[PDB]
Design an enzyme around this catalytic site. Structure first.
Site, PDB file in Angstrom:
ATOM      1  N   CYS A  96       0.895  -1.186   0.147  1.00 53.06           N
ATOM      2  CA  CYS A  96      -0.058   0.104  -0.133  1.00 53.06           C
ATOM      3  C   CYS A  96       1.078   1.233  -0.017  1.00 53.06           C
ATOM      4  CB  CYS A  96      -1.037  -0.038   1.099  1.00 53.06           C
ATOM      5  SG  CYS A  96      -0.219   0.144   2.973  1.00 53.06           S
ATOM      6  N   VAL A  97       0.786   2.274   0.816  1.00 55.19           N
ATOM      7  CA  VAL A  97       1.774   3.308   0.723  1.00 55.19           C
ATOM      8  C   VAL A  97       2.775   3.092   1.688  1.00 55.19           C
ATOM      9  CG1 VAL A  97       1.918   5.807   1.417  1.00 55.19           C
ATOM     10  CG2 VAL A  97      -0.044   5.115   0.393  1.00 55.19           C
TER      11      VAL A  97
END
Length: 161
Positions: A96-97
């Site tokens: 994800c981030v």
């Protein structure tokens, strides 16, 4: 990048450069499940499609299943995610981030389905390699639901001819 199960499945955040992607490759990553939304990917790669082409150019097979920050995959997305993760056991990377919330939720869900772990064990397991894994209540609720629906998920994932 961290491994939850040595060389079979791990997590990470969004890479900033192609060299970081080559680092994944050297680590044993072969397939990548991309969880951030287009705009999050674009912060570092300008265009979501360009980023996906970069993953392929580097020998990694990607699958993009956008999950909003703090959220969980929809039931339809979860079916897609698990069919993908279960298709090949070696070198799975989920990102994800930063590699914490959404990624942690997916990794814990994977353990629940593949090893029959109770939700609390699955969460502790991921937190041991990634502090903070599983960030929101929605994600926590989603994992207990995955444990309760385990048999149903497996049946739907492997529905064949």
């Amino acid at each position: 990048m961290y491994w939850v199960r040595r060389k079979t499945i791990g997590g990470s955040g969004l890479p900033y450069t192609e060299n970081e992607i080559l680092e994944w490759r050297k680590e044993g990553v072969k397939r990548v499940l991309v969880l951030p939304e287009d705009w999050e990917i674009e912060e570092s790669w300008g265009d979501k499609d360009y980023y996906l082409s970069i993953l392929k150019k580097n020998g990694l097979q990607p699958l993009h299943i956008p999950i909003p920050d703090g959220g969980v995959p929809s039931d339809s997305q979860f079916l897609t995610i698990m069919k993908w993760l279960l298709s090949e056991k070696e070198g799975n990377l989920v990102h994800c981030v930063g590699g914490i919330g959404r990624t942690g939720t997916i990794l814990a869900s994977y353990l629940i389905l593949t090893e029959g772990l109770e939700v609390e064990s699955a969460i502790d397991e991921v937190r041991l390699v990634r502090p903070g894994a599983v960030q929101t209540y929605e994600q926590e609720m989603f994992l207990l639901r995955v444990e309760g629906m385990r048999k149903s998920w497996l049946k739907n994932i492997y529905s064949n001819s």
